[PDB]
Amino acid sequence: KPADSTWTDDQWNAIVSTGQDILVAAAAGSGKTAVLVERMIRKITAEENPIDVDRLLVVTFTNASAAEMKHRIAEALEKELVQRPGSLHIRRQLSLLNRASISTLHSFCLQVLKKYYYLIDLDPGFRIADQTEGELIGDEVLDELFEDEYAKGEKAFFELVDRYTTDRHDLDLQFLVKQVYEYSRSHPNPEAWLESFVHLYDVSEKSAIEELPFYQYVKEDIAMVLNGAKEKLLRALELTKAPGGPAPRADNFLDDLAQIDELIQHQDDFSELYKRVPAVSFKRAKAVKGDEFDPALLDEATDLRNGAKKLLEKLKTDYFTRSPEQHLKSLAEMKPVIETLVQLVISYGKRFEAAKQEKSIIDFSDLEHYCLAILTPSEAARFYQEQFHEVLVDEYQDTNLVQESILQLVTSGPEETGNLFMVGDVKQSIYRFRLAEPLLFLSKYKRFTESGEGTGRKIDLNKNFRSRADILDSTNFLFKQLMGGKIGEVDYDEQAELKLGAAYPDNDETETELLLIDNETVQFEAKAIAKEIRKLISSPFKVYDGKKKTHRNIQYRDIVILLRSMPWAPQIMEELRAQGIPVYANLTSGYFEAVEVAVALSVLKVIDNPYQDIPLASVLRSPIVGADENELSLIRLENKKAPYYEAMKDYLAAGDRSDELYQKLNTFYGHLQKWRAFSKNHSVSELIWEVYRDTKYMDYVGGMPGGKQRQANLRVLYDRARQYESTAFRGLFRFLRFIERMQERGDDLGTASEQEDVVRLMTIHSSKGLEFPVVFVAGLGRNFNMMDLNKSYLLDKELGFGTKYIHPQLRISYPTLPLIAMKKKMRRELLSEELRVLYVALTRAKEKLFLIGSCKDHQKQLAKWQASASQTDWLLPEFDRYQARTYLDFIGPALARHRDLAHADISGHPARFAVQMIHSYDLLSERLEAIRRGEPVPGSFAFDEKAREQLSWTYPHQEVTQIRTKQSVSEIKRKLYRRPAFMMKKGLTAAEKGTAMHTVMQHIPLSHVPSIEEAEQTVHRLYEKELLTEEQKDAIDIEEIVQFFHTEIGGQLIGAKWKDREIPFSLALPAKEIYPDAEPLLVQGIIDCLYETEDGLYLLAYKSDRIEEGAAPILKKRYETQIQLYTKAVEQIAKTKVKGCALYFFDGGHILTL
Amino acid sequence: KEVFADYEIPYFIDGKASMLNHPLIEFIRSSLDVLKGNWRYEAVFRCVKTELLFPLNEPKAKVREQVDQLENYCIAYGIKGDRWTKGDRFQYRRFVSLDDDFAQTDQEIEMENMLNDTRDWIVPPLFQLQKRMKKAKTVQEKAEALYRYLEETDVPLKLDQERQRAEDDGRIIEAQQHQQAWDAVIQLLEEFVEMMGDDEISLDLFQQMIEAGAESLTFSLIPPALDQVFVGNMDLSRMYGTSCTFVLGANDGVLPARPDENGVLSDDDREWLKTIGVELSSGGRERLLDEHFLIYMAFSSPSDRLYVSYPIADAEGKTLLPSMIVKRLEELFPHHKERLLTNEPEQVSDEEQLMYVVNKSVAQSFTASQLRLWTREYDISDVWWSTYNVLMSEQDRLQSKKLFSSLFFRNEVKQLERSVSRQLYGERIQGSVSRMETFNACPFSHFASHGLHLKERQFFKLEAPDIGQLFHSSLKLISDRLRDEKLDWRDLTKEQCELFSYDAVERLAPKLQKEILLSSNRHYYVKEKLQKIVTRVSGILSEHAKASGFVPIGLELGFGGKGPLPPLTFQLKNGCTMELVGRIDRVDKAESSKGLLLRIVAYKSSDKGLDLAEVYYGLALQMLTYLDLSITHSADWLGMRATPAGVLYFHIHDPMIQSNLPLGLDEIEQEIFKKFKMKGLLLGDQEVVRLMDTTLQEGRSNIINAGLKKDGSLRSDSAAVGEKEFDLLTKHVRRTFQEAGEQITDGRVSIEPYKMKNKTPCTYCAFKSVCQFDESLEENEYRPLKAEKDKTILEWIKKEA
DNA sequence: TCTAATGCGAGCACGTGCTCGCATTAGATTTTGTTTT
Ligand code: SF4
């Protein structure tokens, strides 16, 4: 249904369209979130036939997006509720939203695991392990597997080891195993993908090179460089037509070109190229003598021709130094080694899963794979299909194959009539190293149509509502000449270009700036950045608030520096902090190089094992103790051969208390011993906190340069210890081992101020989804990371595993053809990703842009840029874009044709640029001493009285904060490690028999004196009522039961007005009556018997004490306080009075009165 | 717990503590881990450090100090498994070199005895436990074996002593939990044998169930007192007469809390079962809707004041969102101020900053931060100045003064007093080139090395220096056997090289790093790798011998100490004599027209050659020192005054050539041979070059880094220099040693690391936690060394002359 | 770990001059990071 309400037609399509799988290509700045929300709201808040929220499935990249989704949906539900308050449905959706399925894919998979744990071999109470924890488990099973393989000693294994290890150790092999396994985990069937490795090496001499898969990349590479050698020579030929250009040398060029064209004719024939390419030679350059020429152009043409020479020689050394038959033979010889490798990796996988199951543990990879195992479509899958009416997926361009196989599985119906709704943008796919596939998005882009006729719908959102025209124009201009072909993987045309949709009052300083620095380079860089920032702050720059239409002077909050990498961040932070610019940046590593963390860890180490000289010396020299070098050496002087700890003990054993160094070491020693005993009974976290308060080290570092950070570094160590308590539970032993093992393999943790007026320095990758008025992108004059394409082996999504030809005995190695193919492929893929990184970089802004890079010589590099910018067509030469290794190599030539820095439309594009050729030379107390002395500062402060009142204050009722409320009679009077039941003899103990008689006494009829028969009858009934255990019933004396009722007190018990037994009481006693100094505490108990006669109220209690005159005075005091507590209870609560108490003893039938 | 303890607030937590930290439970669990994992290092010392294995009525502080040194020993020697249960004594020797063999010092015997005593009281109870456990089949006898293990070690008595100590210190609640722990364990065993006493069970499943039961163990709830702050939940916790109620964690997902459905029955299951007629527990949507009633009961409980708080960030730094309740309260009470809770007082009013100072500890904590903030040009509130004055007005002020000493803290290093340095280093510094280089790189690193003699924890792991020693001693052995059988390196065949090298490594293996190469199959293969390396090196040395005019004089020739050559001696201002002993790797002599020629060759594991910049800064002084001594003593030791032929590095390795051309076996052999082309420095003349490579007629050399033209003169690519440069370099080395030794005796121990070519010595140093170097902290900076070209260096050495 | 400057001789073009072809060392430079409870 069509309607109008501030949406665009495309956005409208993305909201209302239903019936098939829909792909929404949301550009940067497009209201993808708002559209997604509105689309959901309509389904949730419809009038005709609404659906519940829990019938949907929203998959996000980060939890931030899911939470934001939840809140915006909530706000919309609130608005709807304002318009229709009465509706039960709309109200109910707000309650359901907390239980809604708005999660990440990992979280959803977790839900599936928790629900269908029984389908696969999984524990219902499984725990998702730490990355370090799992990797330590992996390391262990690797060592065990390797040890087992060495033990078997198979030839194939040694053959593998000898090839993929150094001459001294076998680490590199185990790293290879880990890598292959991880890379295999990114396929919905890891084992099959691993077993497809051998198909690449299953060749012979009779095999056609041009028919094999990997050759697809070998082909284009040749077609590229040859076409790169032709053009490079055509430009030389054109340079012969120039007036100052050399005319005779064109003959040589006309020869060389003819040779290259000859090669281009046979590009599809690899066998022919082997015969032709190595035979190509460039004739001696015909020297041009005369002053009618031009030395610059003369020497330039030679450079171009030598460029063709370089390219050709590179092509020959890449492919044509051995025959295609020899290539095939080499590739065929490597097959068994590949088979061994695969089986080894598979073994590691099975061992790793078994190990993880042993501890009820899964990975993040297991989170996807176990979920997928569950869904396979199985009953679970059909249930989830039934439940979800639609599945929404955000950032679809970063979805991997396993995630996709889960999405396609949980969605109901084929692609033509599916419910899978997905939104994203390939141009912003910057996560390929995490093995995500943007081709998954692009394939569905081409597969779909703009209509929904018998296929999936594609919808393109072009309008950018959040950024200025200058930004969009600059971006479109640059990436029109950069993205496309094999370097962009996507054609940069209309319907892909950014379109203006933001209403902006024009400013004159919004033009994109480029700052090129001549000649740390980062020093000059950051200084130039600082100057521009300072100029932007000093002279009022107005930032426009699009929502409220008001200009505000720019804050430090609105300025962000974006970097490709973070090693440059510290220096930039230091320089900007020096310039007076507030800077914040988050670090994902460098936590264990912080001095405070090193010292605190050293303390934990000494507490674990004091006989470690280095952590000890660390603690001693640290502010914790404060020993200086003279004092430390003094400690060593006492004992030179023994450990440093022994030397410390010896100094303590020989030193006098009048020494300051003695006080240091002694106080530390007492502290140390306390910690030793403390660590054994408490957790690690508790030990850390106790250390922190006993040393005040956290308080100390809080008062030194950068203490804000330092205290946080010490805080997260406590929090990390608490985190570890789940992994393998508590203990300094376990904790320190875990940290040590984490560092020894090279793993790290973050150093983990979001308030205004701070300049954020962060990675371009992290800036994804964020937006700022002013964006600085530096390091543009710095090389990309091509370290991936150097090793003897390589891993690919399609081709699988490539590797050099390695012969251990002959000590020879040389690259195999599929390896080189993979290198070319991975390079241009990497370059594509980098180009997309530059894209999100430039699109993260709203007002102004700042491009900054460095170089060696300005003019020569400008000519280098002009060399690439000679073509009339929009798109820059694909080979020149391929040869790029620096971000400048992308920006420069694209900017060379522009009017500011080459006819036709390219000059007239509405993009504006400002270029600055910067050079390196152009960038070039009373209170204090009072505190140092320990003396107070002089002055009258308003809070002096308050502070001194509060520091002296003591809680009025402190003496009763520790006093137990509930007490017991035995405990008041007061104011054995038993053996197992199956180790002792058969029952019958003192307490058993005593209680067994007590039960009879409290259950025996008090109507009249019973005989032996009546007593035995009562006992028998208590035996049948299960009031008495059979062992309690078997062992009983019958005499004392008779003896009591023959007594005086017994006779008075039988004859009484009123009787009661086992009367539970709670008594409130003033605190003073039990405690010496300075509010009722409770005292509970059970009075055995009470009876009332015409004389008064009498108390009775039974005791099974050992007796058989002299025992009576002892028994009197043994239960004195007890009886007094009983009498106090009756007299205070019942408000009556007790006249006389009586205690009966079974052992003999004695009675004493109190 | 920790915050209220620190803020002196008495509390009552309606929750039962876990026993998983109690020494008794850990003792049991880690014991079963010893039995299951076959006596792993971790399980064994987890078992020991619970102190329940400690000898009865022995000083805990002494027993611990014994266990520790046993631990360090177990770590360095990789003791595990049956080695614990073997009859063999743990043999100890503080220092062993594979070039000789001594006898045990009385000290080492004393130490070894102590170690074996410690082992002898640790093993038996743990051993006997493994005996019965293997033999026990049913559950009852396994639990019986476990309990016997508890009683034999006198655990009840040790727990009783511990709780008595706890009572004595006043920790009565801590004292009670011991008896609680024992009762818990005994009850667990009883229930176990009650349900499956006669059932035969495996050790793994027994441990699994013991572990499972131990995880459930809870200490009895600490009884409520007369005056406590009641901290509890919002589901089962009950209250009465509450005046003030604090509501915590008003975050989304937390309040209302999303109910985890999981069990045997799902929400759809229970829902359908509800429609059938079966009424079970509530569902997810039901318990989610009950949340409002719970929030209602919590909000309506306080009589006087209600506080609703929420954190915006988690422990790591992840953003936490406010609840729907916060917004609801913002609706019901639209003009109610939101109060900010922060540990950064400068973000709240002075009246709120005044609430911080509640006692001495927290006041000191905050005011130290406030003082640092004050040093950063901030007008901090006067309340902290008031509290500061109070903290310096009462008795305990030195503690506060010490805390506030951080305000002016820098990583300063006090120079060692003359008396202290003289006593520490000694009257005579008997050192080496390595020590002098260590000082030159960083003075403080030298102070911690050859001063404090701090030793890093020794591990049962094969490192690079150990392997280097293996190579050195191997070549030494081969050389000796060569002179024994009247053989020369020229006369060595492939078979002979292989057998010689293999046997040499075989001889050195059982004395290399606590016999690590014999400890596993993996290290066995490492041994074979090393044998292959020594083999190929032997072959290269053979080929080199057949193409060189230089004959090796003394291999591993030591100067000073017991060596044939006398030590180089230095005199200092302090009066302390400084002599350097060392071991020259190899010295070669050769006759020529210039007279006698001497060159020094050192076996390196790296290929990189001598850097004149590194020599200038005294970082590479080995070779030139060796050459200086060899030349200066060439008369009294050998024959006549000789001439420096040069210094050479030999790369010991087994290379893999990466050729892009189909090579033949001979071409491959040549490409391998070319990888051993020695780097270093040479004498700038044709005769010497021809003496080091007699094969070289014209072109480049495959043995030495030099070449020849048609004339006979060496090309500019040759790493050679005149005799002037050599003598100049040696004099520079001597001056470096003199100055270094001078600064050492003066007591200079400052932290001064260098940074040349983006390289720092700090990366290879283990004293990083001792020096506590902080670049951000001023007065602490690297020493930028300009990596100049050789000619610039030599020009500097000339201008210094 | 691959990329750029250096040394010197050989042969090809206009006996001498100059460009190429080879072989090497130094040499400079240098990551990205969600995800659960
Ligand atoms: S680490 Fe760097 S600074 Fe600290 S001592 Fe070793 S060398 Fe000197």
Short mmCIF file of C-alpha atoms (C1' of nucleotides) in Angstrom, two decimals, chain A residues 229-230 233 236 249-263 280-285 301 304-306 308-309 312, chain C residues 20:
data_model
loop_
_atom_site.label_atom_id
_atom_site.label_comp_id
_atom_site.label_asym_id
_atom_site.label_seq_id
_atom_site.Cartn_x
_atom_site.Cartn_y
_atom_site.Cartn_z
CA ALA A 229 53.47 -2.99 -19.80
CA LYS A 230 51.74 -1.94 -23.02
CA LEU A 233 55.17 1.88 -23.32
CA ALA A 236 56.65 6.41 -23.93
CA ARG A 249 64.13 5.88 -29.43
CA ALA A 250 60.55 5.26 -30.59
CA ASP A 251 62.04 2.56 -32.84
CA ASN A 252 63.08 0.57 -29.77
CA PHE A 253 59.65 1.26 -28.26
CA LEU A 254 57.96 0.22 -31.50
CA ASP A 255 59.94 -3.02 -31.16
CA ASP A 256 59.25 -3.66 -27.46
CA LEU A 257 55.55 -2.93 -27.94
CA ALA A 258 55.42 -5.42 -30.82
CA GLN A 259 56.94 -8.04 -28.49
CA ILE A 260 54.47 -7.39 -25.68
CA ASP A 261 51.53 -7.53 -28.10
CA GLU A 262 52.85 -10.88 -29.30
CA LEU A 263 52.56 -12.08 -25.70
CA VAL A 280 61.64 -11.45 -24.88
CA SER A 281 64.52 -8.97 -24.81
CA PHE A 282 64.53 -5.18 -25.13
CA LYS A 283 67.04 -3.91 -27.69
CA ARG A 284 69.77 -1.51 -26.56
CA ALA A 285 68.27 1.96 -26.14
CA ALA A 301 61.02 7.66 -21.14
CA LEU A 304 58.97 3.94 -18.33
CA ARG A 305 60.69 1.40 -20.57
CA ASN A 306 62.58 0.04 -17.57
CA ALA A 308 58.09 -2.52 -18.64
CA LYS A 309 61.34 -4.41 -18.16
CA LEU A 312 58.14 -8.51 -17.60
"C1'" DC C 20 72.80 -3.08 -19.91
#
